[PDB]
Amino acid sequence: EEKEILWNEAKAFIAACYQELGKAAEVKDRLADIKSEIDLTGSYVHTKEELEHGAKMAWRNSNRCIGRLFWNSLNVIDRRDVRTKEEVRDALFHHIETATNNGKIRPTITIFPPEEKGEKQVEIWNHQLIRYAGYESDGERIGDPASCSLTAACEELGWRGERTDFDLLPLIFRMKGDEQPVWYELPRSLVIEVPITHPDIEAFSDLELKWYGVPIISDMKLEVGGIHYNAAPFNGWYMGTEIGARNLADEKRYDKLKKVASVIGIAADYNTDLWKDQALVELNKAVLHSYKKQGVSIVDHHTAASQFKRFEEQAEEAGRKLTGDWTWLIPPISPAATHIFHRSYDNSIVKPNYFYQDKPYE
Amino acid sequence: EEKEILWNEAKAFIAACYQELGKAAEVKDRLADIKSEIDLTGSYVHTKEELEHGAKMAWRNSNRCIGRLFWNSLNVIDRRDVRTKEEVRDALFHHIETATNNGKIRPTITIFPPEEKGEKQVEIWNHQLIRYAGYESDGERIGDPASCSLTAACEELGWRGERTDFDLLPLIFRMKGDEQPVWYELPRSLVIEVPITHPDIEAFSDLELKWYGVPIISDMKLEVGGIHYNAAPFNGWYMGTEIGARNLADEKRYDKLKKVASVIGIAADYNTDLWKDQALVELNKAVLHSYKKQGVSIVDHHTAASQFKRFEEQAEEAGRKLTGDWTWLIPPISPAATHIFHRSYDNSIVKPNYFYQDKPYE
Ligand code: HEM
Ligand code: HEM
Ligand SMILES: Cc1cc(N)nc(CCc2cncc(CCN(C)C)c2)c1
Numbered sequence: 001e002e003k004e005i006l007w008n009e010a011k012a013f014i015a016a017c018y019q020e021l022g023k024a025a026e027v028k029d030r031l032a033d034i035k036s037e038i039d040l041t042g043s044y045v046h047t048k049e050e051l052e053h054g055a056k057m058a059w060r061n062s063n064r065c066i067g068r069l070f071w072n073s074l075n076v077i078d079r080r081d082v083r084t085k086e087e088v089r090d091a092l093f094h095h096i097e098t099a100t101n102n103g104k105i106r107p108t109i110t111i112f113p114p115e116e117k118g119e120k121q122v123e124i125w126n127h128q129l130i131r132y133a134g135y136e137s138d139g140e141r142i143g144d145p146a147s148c149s150l151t152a153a154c155e156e157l158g159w160r161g162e163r164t165d166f167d168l169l170p171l172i173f174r175m176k177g178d179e180q181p182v183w184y185e186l187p188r189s190l191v192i193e194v195p196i197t198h199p200d201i202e203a204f205s206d207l208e209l210k211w212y213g214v215p216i217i218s219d220m221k222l223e224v225g226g227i228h229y230n231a232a233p234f235n236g237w238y239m240g241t242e243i244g245a246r247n248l249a250d251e252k253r254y255d256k257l258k259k260v261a262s263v264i265g266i267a268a269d270y271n272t273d274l275w276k277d278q279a280l281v282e283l284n285k286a287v288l289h290s291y292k293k294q295g296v297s298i299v300d301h302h303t304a305a306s307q308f309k310r311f312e313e314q315a316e317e318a319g320r321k322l323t324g325d326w327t328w329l330i331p332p333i334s335p336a337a338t339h340i341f342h343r344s345y346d347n348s349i350v351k352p353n354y355f356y357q358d359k360p361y362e
Numbered sequence: 363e364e365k366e367i368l369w370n371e372a373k374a375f376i377a378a379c380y381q382e383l384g385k386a387a388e389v390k391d392r393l394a395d396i397k398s399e400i401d402l403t404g405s406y407v408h409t410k411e412e413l414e415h416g417a418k419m420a421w422r423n424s425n426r427c428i429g430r431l432f433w434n435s436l437n438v439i440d441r442r443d444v445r446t447k448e449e450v451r452d453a454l455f456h457h458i459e460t461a462t463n464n465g466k467i468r469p470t471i472t473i474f475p476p477e478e479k480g481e482k483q484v485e486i487w488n489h490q491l492i493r494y495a496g497y498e499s500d501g502e503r504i505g506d507p508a509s510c511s512l513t514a515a516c517e518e519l520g521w522r523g524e525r526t527d528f529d530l531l532p533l534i535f536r537m538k539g540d541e542q543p544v545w546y547e548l549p550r551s552l553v554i555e556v557p558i559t560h561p562d563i564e565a566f567s568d569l570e571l572k573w574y575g576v577p578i579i580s581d582m583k584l585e586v587g588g589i590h591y592n593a594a595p596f597n598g599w600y601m602g603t604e605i606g607a608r609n610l611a612d613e614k615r616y617d618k619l620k621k622v623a624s625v626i627g628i629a630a631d632y633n634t635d636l637w638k639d640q641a642l643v644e645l646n647k648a649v650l651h652s653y654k655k656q657g658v659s660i661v662d663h664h665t666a667a668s669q670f671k672r673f674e675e676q677a678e679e680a681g682r683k684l685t686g687d688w689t690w691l692i693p694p695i696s697p698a699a700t701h702i703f704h705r706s707y708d709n710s711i712v713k714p715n716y717f718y719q720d721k722p723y724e
């Protein structure tokens with residue numbers, strides 16, 4: 001039953017992967033070995049080339065990602081060899097360091113051993129490798145509300161946050177065979193953060209806003225040819241709106257628009273004044289300015305959309321169907337100023353791809 | 363075949379309409395009369411009450427409309443009695459006058475005789491009753507590009523535009539039996555226009571922008587209980603973004619963002635400066651300010667979304683399913699600052715409703 005599904009996924013993947021790599025003549029033999037490996041073992045093992053191209057295809061197929069033009073330059077780190085929590089920890093520290101690259105961010109994925117019988121070898125609890133803690137208790141909100149449930153799980157395991165608005169959560173993951181996950185404080189030297197200032201408005205620094213340099217999603221599953229890599233953290237560089245229009249702006253996140261309005265010297269009393277819109281534009285300008293001043297890679301939503309248009313053009317040129325989720329591709333500010341807003345996209349799921357999975361906390 | 367479809371639509375509509383009106387006991391008899399009327403005539407005729415409530419239901423069911431909270435206060439004008447082009451013209455002039463209401467806009471629909479054998483009695487060519495002409499010839503763009511095809515059709519019929527950027531198109535419609543439509547110049551006294559100025563930036567008036575007061579969609583079909591009212595123009599008041607973020611901003615419309623950037627004194631050289639976003643916010647502030655100064659009804663997108671939230675709440679309270687098109691309901695600026703962005707909607711089509719129809723030009 002499962003080896004039927006596996007074998008079928010393998011045939012589809014290997015065929016497509018080898019076509020793209022100019023190695024179609026090797027398919028039959030490779031497929032032969034896989035058939036035997038599955039029969040004899042219940043699974044199969046990707047070559048380094050297959051794993052690398054698979055991760056790249058999965059990014060290429062990610063409907064919700066505007067940044068896909070650069071899919072083929074993804075840096076794939078093969079860590080299927082890790083067996084200990086120390087090795088996992090050091091691999092995660094290494095990912096942070098190499099992806100950060102002193103600010104010139106390298107899109108990277110680190111791939112850990114895949115599920116066996118659907119049994120995870122390693123299970124990463126963090127949503128992103130770098131993220132801020134959040135607390136809520138008796139009227140008091142501190143930090144990132146989105147992190148409240150994971151923060152509480154961490155404090156159940158003996159970690160204690162300082163309760164600033166920007167506590168770095170520890171790395172937290174569980175090894176096969178262990179009942180509880182382990183946690184490790186992030187070395188501050190590894191984590192680039194960017195204080196938010198505004199190019200023109202000197203008072204903006206009074207808000208004492210900052211954000212971290214590199215978004216590293218660590219809780220999605222990479223599926224490649226029937227093999228389930230549930231632990232495979234990946235990163236790009238930020239699009240500014242992610243920070244300025246969502247992380248710092250949403251009422252259910254840092255909720256800073258009223259405070260932004262005050263420091264930029266506009267009233268926040270009347271909807272018709274469009275003060276939220278003005279505050280959003282200034283906050284987003286500040287975010288882009290700040291990352292660039294500090295030499296940390298970032299892209300604005302106009303440039304990103306222009307790049308995505310090139311991705312569309314390349315898909316058609318290569319004779320590949322384009323898939324996308326319009327609702328996620330449009331930027332959260334000035335969406336109609338982008339070409340994305342004015343066309344539609346097929347939201348079909350194509351594999352290899354990255355998928356959500358259930359949180360082991362909650 | 364057709365009388366089957368008609369009768370079935372009639373049963374569903376009359377049943378629902380009379381439930382809502384507290385007249386469920388009258389359904390059986392009314393349904394009896396309709397059954398006979400269809401058999402004997404091939405069609406049936408709505409009571410004034412049915413027609414009025416039907417138009418209101420159609421608005422309530424319009425998935426792409428954020429303004430639906432006020433569905434039950436729609437002003438329905440029954441003009442099923444018109445037979446001549448003079449009467450149609452005067453009914454259209456009347457709609458403009460009564461809906462405008464000296465600036466305190468009244469949501470209104472005027473309903474003309476419905477299709478018979480699918481044969482239209484009157485066919486309105488205008489997309490909106492008030493709209494600006496557009497011209498393109500040998501490098502030269504003037505006016506509203508969206509109106510180019512209708513403008514060209516009008517000039518085929520002996521009309522000539524002055525070729526300003528804001529020529530009012532004439533009313534243009536065709537009567538049953540006539541090969542060509544007729545056209546009538548709009549009396550300027552009927553048409554309120556609003557010059558666009560900015561509350562703070564005096565130079566904004568140098569752009570010489572203006573827009574008309576009342577959006578009156580005149581080319582959609584109202585379907586009520588199997589009866590097809592192909593000529594039934596309707597209006598609300600504007601949401602500011604329609605004018606400021608789309609009509610005046612789109613590259614394929616008036617394309618004013620670069621000129622806005624210049625008058626507000628910011629550079630339009632770098633994507634990372636978010637100059638388009640800033641220009642959009644200032645243009646949208648100017649639009650709202652200008653309509654309010656002139657005493658013409660308008661709503662900003664924040665207030666409109668708050669009203670739409672109340673519409674959602676009322677639907678659930680009344681035990682009615684809510685339908686909506688997320689892609690049209692989100693405003694084109696700061697969409698994530700509205701609740702709409704953060705939930706989903708069922709885009710199912712429910713009747714009565716308003717529908718697109720093929721343009722007789724093009
Ligand atoms: C190189 C720079 C990149 C940029 C600028 C970029 C941009 C974005 C943005 C703006 C989002 C929406 C995030 C949100 O609203 O939560 C997104 C989602 C996504 N990106 Fe990218 N991305 C990049 C690289 C990558 C890479 C390297 C991968 C994988 C190898 C990836 C896979 C995805 C996936 C799977 C999502 C959806 C995540 C979810 O559903 O929560 N992206 N991207
Ligand atoms: C009272 C004030 C109203 C406001 C503020 C409002 C708001 C809006 C907005 C912003 C749109 C999107 C238009 C576009 O992007 O092209 C829209 C679409 C629509 N509205 Fe409303 N509306 C109002 C009244 C009405 C009325 C009275 C009706 C009908 C009786 C109506 C039916 C519709 C329909 C059918 C659409 C979709 C049109 C299309 O597909 O092009 N609305 N509305
Ligand atoms: C790889 C990558 C690049 C990039 N520019 N951005 C992200 C995602 C940032 C991000 C990751 N995960 C969750 C949220 C908020 C998620 N909500 C929907 C739960 C944001 C990922």
Ligand SMILES: Cc1cc(N)nc(CCc2cncc(CCN(C)C)c2)c1
Nearest residue numbers: 490577578579596597598599600601604
């Ligand atoms: C009734 C009503 C109220 C309101 N506030 N707005 C509109 C629509 C304005 C409008 C009407 N028709 C076409 C466009 C642009 C349409 N493109 C998609 C073709 C805009 C209609």
Ligand SMILES: C[C@H](O)[C@H](O)[C@H]1CNc2nc(N)[nH]c(=O)c2N1
Nearest residue numbers: 340341342343344689690691692
């Ligand atoms: C292709 C895409 O659906 C298209 O740009 C839509 C998006 N949402 C919209 N929403 C509104 N209100 N009006 C529009 O014209 C559009 N255009």
Ligand SMILES: C[C@H](O)[C@H](O)[C@H]1CNc2nc(N)[nH]c(=O)c2N1
Nearest residue numbers: 327328329330702703704705706
């Ligand atoms: C319900 C709705 O789909 C939801 O708000 C989505 C909309 N589009 C989005 N787009 C991005 N990029 N990120 C998000 O978190 C969301 N949220």
Ligand SMILES: [Cl-]
Nearest residue numbers: 215242243247
């Ligand atoms: Cl993020």
Ligand SMILES: [Cl-]
Nearest residue numbers: 577604605609
């Ligand atoms: Cl309009």
